[PDB]
């Protein structure tokens, strides 16, 4: 039903996407939440590189399972 994307800051974010809206949707639903635009973020699953252009539910996403997110540097 839902999923969990945990930022590199250690903050947990409960997310809700469609099974076939592509990984791109996982980044878009967080763009409004954390405000961080695309590209500045990156997704993974237990270390497995996730990629857009494929059905996320067929890729690695599972029911209420945990994913791993990476963000940009602070810059200073």
Swiss-Prot record:
Reported impact of residue 76 to A: Loss of ADP-ribosylation
PTM note: Phosphorylated at Ser-65 by PINK1 during mitophagy. Phosphorylated ubiquitin specifically binds and activates parkin (PRKN), triggering mitophagy. Phosphorylation does not affect E1-mediated E2 charging of ubiquitin but affects discharging of E2 enzymes to form polyubiquitin chains. It also affects deubiquitination by deubiquitinase enzymes such as USP30.
Outcome of substituting residue 74 to G: No effect on ADP-ribosylation
Top-level taxon in the UniProt lineage: Eukaryota
Modified residues (ADP-ribosylglycine): 76
Boundaries of every Ubiquitin-like domain copy: 1-76
Residues that span the membrane, as ranges: none
Site for Essential for function, residues: 68
Membrane topology qualifier: Peripheral membrane protein
Annotated positions for site Interacts with activating enzyme: 54, 72
Residue numbers of Phosphoserine PTMs: 65
Impact reported for residue 74 to K: No effect on ADP-ribosylation
Cross-link named Glycyl lysine isopeptide (Gly-Lys) (interchain with K-? in acceptor proteins), sites: 76
Protein name, UniProt field: Ubiquitin
Gene source species: Homo sapiens (Human)
First and last residues shown, out of full length: 1 to 76 of 229
């Amino acid at each position: 039903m839902q999923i969990f994307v945990k930022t590199a800051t250690g903050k947990t974010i409960t997310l809700e996407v469609e099974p076939s809206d592509t990984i791109e949707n996982v980044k878009a639903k967080i763009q409004d939440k954390e405000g961080i635009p695309p590209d500045q973020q990156r997704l993974a699953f237990a270390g497995k590189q996730l990629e857009d252009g494929r059905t996320l539910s067929d890729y690695n996403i599972q029911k209420e399972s945990t994913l791993h997110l990476a963000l940009r540097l602070r810059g200073g």
